[PDB]
């Protein structure tokens, strides 16, 4: 069967913290008063919730209310416990309160409001310097949650709030986040298609924090190369083929060989044979202002098949790509 895997970092965090820290099922929610909040406008409606701009009428401050759609009780307590454990961490969204919505009869998560700059505007206008600056802010959030025994599992632009005016970044939507327990087999149906790590695409369930680093690499590649999304799969199978056309099939076969994974037989007909492409191949006159040897070397170290061989968030912060960033 598949060979087991453990993270190379923060393996023992949930072991040396008390059971109350990670045992989200046993957590007793301290309910706030829904009357403290007045809904202003609907901001969005996702697959798991309806999001509203609101006012905390006790201090007249702008807040965001995430009214959870009815889903398994376990999923809701896990998000709450993770948000509470991470509260106050660098660039982590602050959960201000938890109330019972009077209409839905479900929990409503109250968060600090972030004046998020338009995604299009950020994608099209962030400079080489700003990309490095914001990547460093994301790494602060990832190293914090990983050091706290949590993996996000849904790192992507939609889950990163940027208030560009105040150079403020927040990592949001901890709805897919999980506690990392060495040897635990996790559901591979996490992250959005273009951000899925090769471990998820090959159905390797013993993954860890390093999945977030692959997702981060996907975000970076699209941004610096002006190729949205960087790995543009038509489905989860073609998603692996898109990766293989850049990283090559030989290192993919080495990866599956090392972990004793058996590829789904449907790959035999679609994967073909591909050599690794040098990162300089993706450079052209419309993206050369966002690329540098440091950017390419950094990307190279995140987008690796072997989840164990990727830079951790802390090593990533030491990379020459960030030397120019004012600290
Ligand atoms: N703290 C916040 N400040 C400002 N806007 C927010 C905040 N939190 C969430 N939003 C807005 O709500 C959107 C969705 O939030 P979230 O992803 O947590 O809900 P979801 O159920 O996953 O919805 P979706 O399916 O759209 O992702 C975000 O993309 C963002 O635009
Ligand atoms: C530094 C960096 C790199 C790649 C990205 O897509 C982003 C980014 C993050 C969040 C949003 C807004 N939701 C937009 C962008 Cl471009 C940032």
Numbering used by the authors: 3 to 329
What did the authors write?
CK2 is a serine/threonine kinase that is a key regulator of many cellular processes and is involved in cellular proliferation and anti-apoptotic mechanisms. In vivo it exists mainly as a holoenzyme composed of two catalytic (α and/or α′) and a dimer of regulatory (β) subunits, but it can also be found as the isolated subunits. Unlike most other kinases it is constitutively active and more than 300 proteins have been identified as CK2 substrates, making it probably one of the most pleiotropic proteins in eukaryotic systems. Hence, CK2 has been recognised as a highly promising target for anti-cancer therapies.
A number of mono- and di-substituted rings and bicyclic systems were investigated. The compounds tested so far were not able to effectively inhibit the protein activity as ATP was not displaced. Indeed, most of the co-crystal structures featured a molecule of ATP/ADP in the ATP binding site as well as the ligands bound in the αD pocket.
